[PDB]
Design a protein around this ligand. Structure first.
Ligand SMILES: Cc1ccc(F)c2cc(C(=O)N[C@@H]3CCC[C@H](N4CC[C@H](N(C)S(C)(=O)=O)C4)C3)[nH]c12
Ligand SMILES: C[S@@+](CC[C@H](N)C(=O)[O-])C[C@H]1O[C@@H](n2cnc3c(N)ncnc32)[C@H](O)[C@@H]1O
Ligand SMILES: [Zn+2]
Ligand SMILES: [Zn+2]
Ligand SMILES: [Zn+2]
Length: 239
């Protein structure tokens, strides 16, 4: 099919022109962090600073043993490893090399541009953060408009991320009943964010997918075309 790279979305003019020719997805507002529709001392880890030779050797500053990494909290600028800290991936946009592609029936999708090792950070899922009332309001709005794609993601109690109008290329990852990625909820400056992380080695060219768990709403449920042997048949939660 037709494909495009993440830089292609930085030009709002070349994009809208590309969209008309079915060589890029529909236009949306690109944002680099969540936008809270309604608005609702710090502790650094105890990792030992890495030596000049240790970093050169290929040692990880704030690796698997980091106090913050083990609670899925990112370190701040005030980390003892400073610049070298590998636990600031959201804040530094340390995203994987991914392309936006057209699938057969699922609309647009994400694929690995290179081989992606297991538990690699893909993309932060950014959008407008809604409460339970605002979310339910917009499902009815989107249903009335007769939208085909829905871009809701559960963040926490009374916080749902909506990437329908505003977000980034994370909003193109499709559901699979047998996924190669998962969601991980991460704390940055006392605030919870959600990103996609590989659960296995994704070969270059392979579509990136996660298991979208979300409580179903309404009578009609979207059919699943993920093509897996164990396909649940529909997107979301049991009922
Ligand atoms: C981020 C992401 C990745 C991959 C995915 F597959 C998804 C899917 C969603 C998503 O937001 N789905 C919506 C959840 C709320 C209920 C929505 N229903 C759809 C039909 C029904 N009617 C219009 S109705 C009222 O006519 O029954 C309402 C579906 N997000 C995804
Ligand atoms: C967050 S959007 C993903 C990007 C979407 N394909 C697009 O073109 O904008 C989720 C929507 O994509 C479609 N979708 C995602 N995964 C799917 C799947 N496994 N089977 C069928 N449709 C899927 C559904 O219409 C769903 O509401
Ligand atoms: Zn640390
Ligand atoms: Zn750190
Ligand atoms: Zn499926």
């Amino acid at each position: 099919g037709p494909s495009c790279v993440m830089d292609d979305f930085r030009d709002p003019q070349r994009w809208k022109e590309c969209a008309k020719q079915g060589k890029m997805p529909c236009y949306f507002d690109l944002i680099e962090e969540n936008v809270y529709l309604t608005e609702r001392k710090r502790m650094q880890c105890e990792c030992t600073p890495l030596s000049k030779d240790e970093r050169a050797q290929g040692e990880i500053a704030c690796g698997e043993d980091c106090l913050n990494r083990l609670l899925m909290i990112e370190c701040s600028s005030r980390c003892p490893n400073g610049d070298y800290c590998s636990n600031r991936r959201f804040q530094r946009k340390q995203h994987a090399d991914v392309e936006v592609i057209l699938t057969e029936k699922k609309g647009w999708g994400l694929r690995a541009a290179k081989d992606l090792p297991s538990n690699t950070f893909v993309l932060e899922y950014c959008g407008e953060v809604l409460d339970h009332k605002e979310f339910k309001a917009r499902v009815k709005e989107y249903a009335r408009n007769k939208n085909i794609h829905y871009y809701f993601m559960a963040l926490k109690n009374d916080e749902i991320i909506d990437a329908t109008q505003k977000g980034n290329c994370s909003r193109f990852m499709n559901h699979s009943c047998e996924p190669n990625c998962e969601t991980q909820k991460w704390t940055v400056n006392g605030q919870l964010r959600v990103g996609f992380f590989t659960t296995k080695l994704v070969p270059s060219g392979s579509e990136l997918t996660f298991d979208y768990q979300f409580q179903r709403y309404g009578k009609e449920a979207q059919k699943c075309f993920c093509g897996s042997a164990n396909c649940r048949g529909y997107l979301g939660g049991e009922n």
